[PDB]
Amino acid sequence: CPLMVKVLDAVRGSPAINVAVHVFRKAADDTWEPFASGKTSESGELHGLTTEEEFVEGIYKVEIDTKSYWKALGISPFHEHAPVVFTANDSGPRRYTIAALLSPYSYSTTAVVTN
Amino acid sequence: CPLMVKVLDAVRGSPAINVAVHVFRKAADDTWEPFASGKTSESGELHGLTTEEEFVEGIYKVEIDTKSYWKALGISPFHEHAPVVFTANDSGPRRYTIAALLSPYSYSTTAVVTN
Amino acid sequence: CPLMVKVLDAVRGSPAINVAVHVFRKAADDTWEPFASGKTSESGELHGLTTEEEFVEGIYKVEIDTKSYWKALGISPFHEHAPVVFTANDSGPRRYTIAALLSPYSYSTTAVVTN
Amino acid sequence: CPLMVKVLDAVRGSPAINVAVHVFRKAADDTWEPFASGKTSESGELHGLTTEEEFVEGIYKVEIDTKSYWKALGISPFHEHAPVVFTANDSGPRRYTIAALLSPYSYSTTAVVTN
Ligand code: NA
Ligand code: NA
């Protein structure tokens, strides 16, 4: 698996558990088409979204459902969700980790791309 | 000025100048409709996107064109752009500052909402 | 105003008001000597810490008292404080803004340095 | 091992490899005393700093040597280092991960405390 998502909670100092994540790929007609989805584990990680066979070059969007996460914790959030948009390029062997750090009114995202 | 955008460059420790920003608002048909756009100034700020009259309740997307910013500096970055999605003016008018802090493979965004 | 400090609260999406800040400068004996201090205003900013005359070359530490800020809000945070350590004015005078974005278990700090 | 350090590089989109990390504990005389140290691995992680026996309650400082990291990559940095200061409390079983995300003029740190 070439694409992993990891989410942390900056208020509790914990992995962000049970966060829904939806991945889309841009189609030929320029629309976002569903590609993969899941919920983060107890470690805040989401593994097994795709395979090397299916994860071809293209433009992808990883949407982290931040609003539902904060509401389930009884906390008042700002954003609807956190979308992370990027091109996947076959510049040799690569693994992509989309990491995100969440606060109710702020978030950061980092791409960790390794060989 | 109920909606302002501020962008900083984390590599240089400076305002991110001439960054293009496109704002959209979700329409009744659920599509993203163009709402306003502009570019950041020498201070990294973008003022005058809208007015209290035009900035009605709704779901908005502020898209910061991070890829074009890094490419104009001769750098190949990871993300296509940084979209920031939120509901605005649902409890009456507020002033919103959407701030972003950019690095080639990472960004943070914060909302500062004042009454 | 060659040294300014700005602090935001990532939980509320607001300026962090009344945050204590202590600045130190490394002395010849390698100890941290008090240099200036103050508290952030209603805008989350702290102005007037020093003057161009007093702000000589040196190694400085800007300590943001994050624990006292969260405790005054009735929250038990992780960090004791957020120290920001850097050399200043080594290539002539510059204006420095030390910005910090706070959450109970996490913070970010950015330096904006202008000539 | 109850204390782990993880560092990412926001410019390259990679683990921050070979970063020196120095941990100190506050002594009875209020001075910072060396406690443990090491360099991050190829995964950007530093394991085996201490043991449950030695990691008693107290005030600790984890110093990440950011300036030397950026200089070894041929990149111009702002901060001397990134110090992370906190109390370790035996509120039941706990593991502490000090995570940091580095850019030349900005960094973030998050504490992930799990049971
Ligand atoms: Na406006
Ligand atoms: Na000043």
Numbering used by the authors:
A (entry chain A), B (entry chain B), C (entry chain B), D (entry chain A): 10 to 124
Give the exact sentences the study uses for this entry.
Transthyretin (TTR)3 is a 55-kDa protein that aggregates into amyloid fibrils under pathological conditions. In its native tetrameric conformation, TTR transports retinol-binding protein and thyroxine (T4) in the blood and cerebrospinal fluid. Amyloid aggregation of TTR occurs by dissociation of tetrameric TTR into monomers; these partially unfold into amyloidogenic intermediates and self-associate into soluble oligomers and amyloid aggregates. Here we identify two segments of TTR that drive protein aggregation by self-association and formation of steric zipper spines of amyloid fibrils.
To pinpoint which of the eight segments drives aggregation within full-length TTR, we created individual proline substitutions within each segment. We chose the substitution to proline because it is known to inhibit fibril formation. None of the proline variants fully halted TTR aggregation, but substitutions S85P, E92P, and V94P and the S85P/E92P double substitution significantly decreased protein aggregation and altered aggregate morphology. In the isolated segment 91AEVVFT96, proline replacements in positions 92 and 94 completely prevented fibrillization. These data suggest that the 91AEVVFT96 segment and the N-terminally adjacent region of full-length TTR are important for fibril formation. The side chain organization explains why the residue replacements E92P and V94P hinder TTR aggregation because the proline substitution would decrease the shape complementarity between sheets in the steric zipper structure. Substitutions in strand F, E92P and V94P, most likely hinder self-recognition and further aggregation.
